[PDB]
């Protein structure tokens, strides 16, 4: 089945939605799942024939862009192609996990045996099932991937590349060629996170006192922490994860500084504004799948359990906040990594504790890539690679770009990882300028 | 007492903060309060002598702009002025209301006798206490007021106008000349909110079914509502206040439509996402003063409080949700106003119940405006007045503009009330063009 | 018959003229009259298929635009449409009134029985008779109406609407729903003309002396006036009608001020330059039909016995020039209305005196509008409505816009009534932006 | 004696007027005349010290620019200079001639002995009398001369050059070095006027019929032809001067073509509109001095002996309209010259008939130019010269440019004689770019 809505309007855009019914798992008839996508076009061009473009979203569990005005990259794309945002399975309108009608999975083994169907290879088989119905003569199409969308795109070049005309990637090339790469990624991640912390305190020198006094207050508190309004607890380990977006975002440094002005109530206790802000800072309540799947995207065989938790002990002498305050050193924030204790501190994660360990123990994951095809690719590929990036290490990207046959790649220090959202207008022009041949090979 | 910080930077801007200590009540020496402001200038222009500009942010209890990039009206103003952003007393960093250290006020009577010092007349006396210290030779300056900032500006033209060079107002002219205007303002508001609901359903025709079906589910549920994650309750009265920002803001219609797609948990229950989003929708947890003082800004004598709660009985035949579903009519959302039951439903308002009654019973408020001075004013004034506004009635504004000697104004239907935050670049150019004399009087 | 000229050129435009032979009155065979129109297109696009657009000129009995360079609205319209410019029956090249052979009509009654065919409904029947011959497959077309063109456009929505794709109106919505609205229009008009005179003297304070001295000299002169070069007479009544164009035009105040500098010959007598300029100020020499029909366009039934003359007696306490100079008050100018004495003072009007009385005495005119159809219209309509307009009262327009089913409109203060001719480039873009759906309904 | 007005405003400009009392003849103490000028500046620069600029107007006896908005060259000039606009002695507000109380000159001998004080040399002595009072330290200033302003500028380089910083000229270099150049100028003029007529009929081929029919109707009519409304007469000689502005203007061809569509009243008689338009076509009513002085501007010692009337006899075989229609050739229009019969046909010129002869008969006119100084000039000069110009012969200009020591000039075929009023934005940038040294000598 395939069903289609009426057109509706937003300033300078026309939008429509489609819904599909698709297998939960291929090679068997049932269960079914439903998947959602929205087609977007410029005001006059509803029935006009044009090339179709697919957008793949920047994380393991986030909804698509949901635009409210013509702006940024969407405004540029829609003059030339047909933006088709698509909610990936397990998020948004595309069949998320149930709640209030409390979970149908009676035991953690049932949930663990269900969640394994949400890996990137099924998202490619799903995108194929769309294209062949949605594109009018079943022609090829072009794909744009941000972050985890680039991880999907390389599985798409690996399996069934016949549907692709050309591929655009921003900040999203994965490391490849091992059973589990997670140790190599996090080993480098802890070295780059130190740099980001130094640039922060170099820009705002007065904050070193604020964070040290706050860590002492948390450490001396009766429970080793203080209770949030939503029944979680703030602790110095929790405070060190506050930088997860704050050091990597295009706007993170300024937003983080304004929050640290607000810690103490007026005349001494922690302010209710600060507790409310901290409780609201990150999305594990709305997008719980992001905490569950984060280790698994690096696995193609033999697994590793809680790999970032193993690695931080290698750097404990600088990342332990309760050493840092005794040694009079500045405390360090952390980002894009998950730890076992985090399922106990954060109220939204409480019920997932058992299923998260069953996934962490799972061996025999199915493969995602095959280098023997990527080594003789014929599809045009263009990639933006940020140099000082916290989320994926440059040295791993630049060696992996050796295996793709025909990739064109550009390196820049000008942008943070968010750089398609902010200033995205010039990124699309620069990437299309390479594929379209207006900037030929040097 | 007066203290000043080091300069720091944001993309294309320079910022610094000043802090002052000021009397609670200007009739007395003590108690004393602290007040905060941030000076902003263009890159490298730190030492250069230039005219000052003051911005009054104009939510009835809200914090200042807190910028993170040069964009919108600030990017324009810094080409010509040294901008000052002020956190008003009792909010933001200017001595907010005490909690976490549990409330110093012994009873509702003590708290009520404290809150009465936070009116607009004290905010003017406070703004002049800054000017004489901050400006190099105590010279005049220019003021810009959005919304309640315009209410402040007319008290500033009424009392101590000698500090003003010229005045700019957006959407912010109050009605004047009566002991309490609140009844007339809400009487006009219910005529206009009906129109806004008609334009919404005309644009999104399928929503009529969704809201009717949701209201039945709430009305049939045990106790006539469902519990929020934070221990509040959702009821059809609570659902009618969902439109408060959603009908009046620039992006409100689109935002609201994307929220109503996600009500039902996939295969019957309300989704955890919808309850979490509804709990997050409005700011009464961060800004409790905005619920407390909202009626008092219309009073200069006998108050007759809970005026909006009297007035909706005149319109109950169309605003009753149960009559609407039984008569098969589309149910209506409601605008910016507050009702007694809201202090019971909303968890953040629970402790303020008794204090809100004492403020509704108080009946000897000090005056705000001085018409026998306004009728012979000599300061230049320019105002933007929106025609299809929801938050202030055009008919009351256009007659009140008769009482100011020198005023110029432009009526427009092109913008919603939020129209300084979106497209603010052309608003500042158009208003300055009148006062600066490049567009002489027709 | 239908005849068509050769193409010819103007800087950046291609032009051609068509001529048609049409009945003087429908439902009878004869006599015939000639109607004239000019098709205009951009440089390369003589034979390219494109949508047609019709322009309706804004003064009753005024001639078409006659362009001489690509500029203003015509330059923009030709980016999308094949523009048609129409000379209305009884003016321009479309059969104007004969004078040079002889005043042919035998008696004033014969002339009166001829003139009554020149109302708006016949102009719509001419436009229909053109479309079906000129448009290549007899498709619908779009119409643009400045001023009186809007009065025609509402008759076109009332009768034979099937030819219209979409409708654009500037400053041209008529009042409707009564037998004769003329008294209500002129009753409102004097309340606006008073404020225009206040804004004039507020801008040029020294002029009050000039007009008072000039009125005294005219009043003391033999016969209460002075003779013009063309044998008319200048009198203080004649002086008050300078304001017609002078207060309404986009450059009116400046033009008027530069004329009053040159009243006296240098050293006492009135200047030959001033008399020659005053004689040249009005258009009644070229457009006599504009003086004849001016009250008749408001009569849907009944009759008007010189309604503007009846109304000024209500305001004569301020509009009497002799009262003004005796009481030392500023004398007031007047505009956009005609009085019985004007046919005696103005040389070009002398022969029409008798026919103008018969048209004032006539009753039972044919009706112009069909409200029970306008109440269920389906054609898209967009209107520009000027807030401070001397020609048409905003308070009548804003209620009349209730009766049209689907109308969208923008109120603005920023343009005078001439705003489609002067700075008109943006008006066409703003009105098309509403109809074309780039700015969806708030 | 010197007096100054209040500032007043026009869109994007500030204006003020000054008035001076000046000798009629500088060799005498009396009588005295009034001279008027208006200073113009951009918004807010009223008190700022800046270089002054003087503008000298296009034709003998024409009034100054009288701006109504910032547009054209004035908008650009005010970016750098404080502009001064001068009404020349004997025209505009600078003491014009007088009617109403008839004419003070009881005899043509008195008027003839009075008018000789209005030549170009006295205009330079007026400009020096102003500068020394108006410029704050009696510094030098820059002059911009259009057409006859260029004739003034070469006398200003010939006598008292010490006040000039730099000189700009458009289309205005006079021929020099003989006692009366008028015969040489009019001998060349007919060789250009013939080519302008060829280009007109080549562009509008159908007009040849219209002018031939209209000439026959005039010629067969009783007496000279048809009476005008103002008591003049239209005759075939009168028709040949209709093209005077019509061939020379930047828009003239199109305006002339539209007027020739209107010649007949509908069903054969000459139309009332055409007679009124023709009577209004040229300015001898408003600027009578332009007809009286026109030949005298070429004379030094020798007579202005009706040279244009002597010269057309050399070309009469093609310029006689009656020969042209009998031989079936297209009739030719004429321009920029005056004939003795014109004082009989044109009602505005009737009283000057005797005085015009006494000027034409004069000898011993004082000299205007000083070639032994111009050949060793040191002031910078830049000139725009038009190749296909009807007013001044390019061949006479380019030999005269040999006698100026340092002149830079540019020759183009891009502009008609009126170019400064239309392309003025780029003309002023190009000429300043030569003087300022941004385009150095090739």
PDB file of C-alpha atoms in Angstrom, chain D residues 216-328:
ATOM      1  CA  UNK D 216      -2.751  70.425 -47.644  1.00  0.00           C
ATOM      2  CA  UNK D 217      -5.659  71.098 -45.226  1.00  0.00           C
ATOM      3  CA  UNK D 218      -3.787  74.079 -43.685  1.00  0.00           C
ATOM      4  CA  UNK D 219      -2.796  75.413 -47.145  1.00  0.00           C
ATOM      5  CA  UNK D 220      -6.351  75.163 -48.631  1.00  0.00           C
ATOM      6  CA  UNK D 221      -7.979  76.799 -45.531  1.00  0.00           C
ATOM      7  CA  UNK D 222      -9.056  80.488 -45.596  1.00  0.00           C
ATOM      8  CA  UNK D 223      -6.235  82.963 -44.821  1.00  0.00           C
ATOM      9  CA  UNK D 224      -2.983  81.664 -43.266  1.00  0.00           C
ATOM     10  CA  UNK D 225      -4.765  78.568 -41.880  1.00  0.00           C
ATOM     11  CA  UNK D 226      -6.714  77.822 -38.636  1.00  0.00           C
ATOM     12  CA  UNK D 227      -7.050  80.126 -35.517  1.00  0.00           C
ATOM     13  CA  UNK D 228      -5.764  78.933 -32.115  1.00  0.00           C
ATOM     14  CA  UNK D 229      -7.896  79.158 -28.897  1.00  0.00           C
ATOM     15  CA  UNK D 230      -5.490  81.882 -27.553  1.00  0.00           C
ATOM     16  CA  UNK D 231      -5.896  84.038 -30.749  1.00  0.00           C
ATOM     17  CA  UNK D 232      -2.684  82.919 -32.544  1.00  0.00           C
ATOM     18  CA  UNK D 233      -2.748  81.118 -35.949  1.00  0.00           C
ATOM     19  CA  UNK D 234      -1.545  77.666 -37.136  1.00  0.00           C
ATOM     20  CA  UNK D 235       0.062  77.746 -40.633  1.00  0.00           C
ATOM     21  CA  UNK D 236       2.458  75.422 -42.599  1.00  0.00           C
ATOM     22  CA  UNK D 237       5.467  77.537 -41.421  1.00  0.00           C
ATOM     23  CA  UNK D 238       4.153  77.092 -37.840  1.00  0.00           C
ATOM     24  CA  UNK D 239       3.915  73.312 -38.387  1.00  0.00           C
ATOM     25  CA  UNK D 240       7.600  73.150 -39.504  1.00  0.00           C
ATOM     26  CA  UNK D 241       8.725  74.494 -36.067  1.00  0.00           C
ATOM     27  CA  UNK D 242       6.704  71.805 -34.195  1.00  0.00           C
ATOM     28  CA  UNK D 243       9.761  69.490 -34.406  1.00  0.00           C
ATOM     29  CA  UNK D 244      12.034  72.046 -32.598  1.00  0.00           C
ATOM     30  CA  UNK D 245      12.135  70.055 -29.321  1.00  0.00           C
ATOM     31  CA  UNK D 246      10.628  66.970 -31.075  1.00  0.00           C
ATOM     32  CA  UNK D 247      13.839  66.062 -32.999  1.00  0.00           C
ATOM     33  CA  UNK D 248      16.344  67.337 -30.358  1.00  0.00           C
ATOM     34  CA  UNK D 249      14.996  65.815 -27.085  1.00  0.00           C
ATOM     35  CA  UNK D 250      16.035  62.371 -25.724  1.00  0.00           C
ATOM     36  CA  UNK D 251      12.301  61.341 -25.868  1.00  0.00           C
ATOM     37  CA  UNK D 252      11.182  63.655 -28.693  1.00  0.00           C
ATOM     38  CA  UNK D 253      10.567  61.130 -31.525  1.00  0.00           C
ATOM     39  CA  UNK D 254       8.010  59.138 -29.511  1.00  0.00           C
ATOM     40  CA  UNK D 255       6.151  62.178 -28.099  1.00  0.00           C
ATOM     41  CA  UNK D 256       5.934  63.650 -31.620  1.00  0.00           C
ATOM     42  CA  UNK D 257       4.570  60.364 -33.053  1.00  0.00           C
ATOM     43  CA  UNK D 258       1.821  60.090 -30.390  1.00  0.00           C
ATOM     44  CA  UNK D 259       0.714  63.696 -31.055  1.00  0.00           C
ATOM     45  CA  UNK D 260       0.330  62.999 -34.822  1.00  0.00           C
ATOM     46  CA  UNK D 261      -2.177  60.139 -34.078  1.00  0.00           C
ATOM     47  CA  UNK D 262      -4.735  62.744 -32.819  1.00  0.00           C
ATOM     48  CA  UNK D 263      -5.082  65.225 -35.725  1.00  0.00           C
ATOM     49  CA  UNK D 264      -8.731  64.563 -36.872  1.00  0.00           C
ATOM     50  CA  UNK D 265     -12.094  64.744 -35.025  1.00  0.00           C
ATOM     51  CA  UNK D 266     -14.160  61.506 -35.528  1.00  0.00           C
ATOM     52  CA  UNK D 267     -17.004  61.386 -38.124  1.00  0.00           C
ATOM     53  CA  UNK D 268     -13.266  65.983 -41.610  1.00  0.00           C
ATOM     54  CA  UNK D 269     -12.009  68.636 -39.130  1.00  0.00           C
ATOM     55  CA  UNK D 270      -8.779  69.517 -37.283  1.00  0.00           C
ATOM     56  CA  UNK D 271      -9.297  68.182 -33.737  1.00  0.00           C
ATOM     57  CA  UNK D 272      -9.816  70.395 -30.654  1.00  0.00           C
ATOM     58  CA  UNK D 273      -7.239  68.335 -28.692  1.00  0.00           C
ATOM     59  CA  UNK D 274      -4.481  68.810 -31.305  1.00  0.00           C
ATOM     60  CA  UNK D 275      -4.987  72.616 -31.377  1.00  0.00           C
ATOM     61  CA  UNK D 276      -4.791  72.754 -27.560  1.00  0.00           C
ATOM     62  CA  UNK D 277      -1.671  70.513 -27.480  1.00  0.00           C
ATOM     63  CA  UNK D 278       0.093  72.561 -30.214  1.00  0.00           C
ATOM     64  CA  UNK D 279      -0.697  75.847 -28.387  1.00  0.00           C
ATOM     65  CA  UNK D 280       0.869  74.247 -25.248  1.00  0.00           C
ATOM     66  CA  UNK D 281       3.926  72.701 -26.998  1.00  0.00           C
ATOM     67  CA  UNK D 282       6.617  75.423 -26.436  1.00  0.00           C
ATOM     68  CA  UNK D 283       7.427  77.992 -23.766  1.00  0.00           C
ATOM     69  CA  UNK D 284       7.453  81.483 -25.418  1.00  0.00           C
ATOM     70  CA  UNK D 285       4.559  82.503 -23.082  1.00  0.00           C
ATOM     71  CA  UNK D 286       6.548  81.707 -19.885  1.00  0.00           C
ATOM     72  CA  UNK D 287      10.098  82.596 -21.125  1.00  0.00           C
ATOM     73  CA  UNK D 288       9.779  85.461 -23.706  1.00  0.00           C
ATOM     74  CA  UNK D 289      13.444  86.514 -23.181  1.00  0.00           C
ATOM     75  CA  UNK D 290      14.530  83.234 -24.887  1.00  0.00           C
ATOM     76  CA  UNK D 291      13.150  84.513 -28.235  1.00  0.00           C
ATOM     77  CA  UNK D 292      14.686  88.026 -27.942  1.00  0.00           C
ATOM     78  CA  UNK D 293      18.349  87.196 -27.136  1.00  0.00           C
ATOM     79  CA  UNK D 294      18.804  83.966 -29.136  1.00  0.00           C
ATOM     80  CA  UNK D 295      20.986  85.271 -32.026  1.00  0.00           C
ATOM     81  CA  UNK D 296      22.885  87.887 -29.943  1.00  0.00           C
ATOM     82  CA  UNK D 297      24.850  85.244 -27.912  1.00  0.00           C
ATOM     83  CA  UNK D 298      27.102  84.690 -31.010  1.00  0.00           C
ATOM     84  CA  UNK D 299      27.967  88.396 -31.600  1.00  0.00           C
ATOM     85  CA  UNK D 300      31.021  90.525 -30.630  1.00  0.00           C
ATOM     86  CA  UNK D 301      31.145  93.969 -32.361  1.00  0.00           C
ATOM     87  CA  UNK D 302      29.338  92.763 -35.561  1.00  0.00           C
ATOM     88  CA  UNK D 303      25.520  92.503 -36.040  1.00  0.00           C
ATOM     89  CA  UNK D 304      22.991  89.696 -35.351  1.00  0.00           C
ATOM     90  CA  UNK D 305      21.429  90.387 -38.807  1.00  0.00           C
ATOM     91  CA  UNK D 306      18.646  87.688 -38.804  1.00  0.00           C
ATOM     92  CA  UNK D 307      21.273  85.127 -39.930  1.00  0.00           C
ATOM     93  CA  UNK D 308      18.970  82.039 -39.751  1.00  0.00           C
ATOM     94  CA  UNK D 309      16.462  83.829 -42.058  1.00  0.00           C
ATOM     95  CA  UNK D 310      19.297  84.762 -44.487  1.00  0.00           C
ATOM     96  CA  UNK D 311      20.569  81.144 -44.436  1.00  0.00           C
ATOM     97  CA  UNK D 312      17.323  79.146 -45.089  1.00  0.00           C
ATOM     98  CA  UNK D 313      17.105  80.786 -48.565  1.00  0.00           C
ATOM     99  CA  UNK D 314      20.213  78.654 -49.450  1.00  0.00           C
ATOM    100  CA  UNK D 315      18.229  75.435 -48.624  1.00  0.00           C
ATOM    101  CA  UNK D 316      14.658  76.560 -49.502  1.00  0.00           C
ATOM    102  CA  UNK D 317      14.451  74.094 -52.451  1.00  0.00           C
ATOM    103  CA  UNK D 318      14.039  71.288 -49.800  1.00  0.00           C
ATOM    104  CA  UNK D 319      12.595  73.267 -46.828  1.00  0.00           C
ATOM    105  CA  UNK D 320       9.629  74.877 -48.722  1.00  0.00           C
ATOM    106  CA  UNK D 321       6.617  72.780 -47.594  1.00  0.00           C
ATOM    107  CA  UNK D 322       4.533  73.730 -50.674  1.00  0.00           C
ATOM    108  CA  UNK D 323       7.253  72.525 -53.085  1.00  0.00           C
ATOM    109  CA  UNK D 324       7.636  69.343 -50.990  1.00  0.00           C
ATOM    110  CA  UNK D 325       3.894  68.397 -51.195  1.00  0.00           C
ATOM    111  CA  UNK D 326       3.657  69.280 -54.951  1.00  0.00           C
ATOM    112  CA  UNK D 327       6.753  67.121 -55.669  1.00  0.00           C
ATOM    113  CA  UNK D 328       5.385  64.304 -53.338  1.00  0.00           C
TER     114      UNK D 328
END
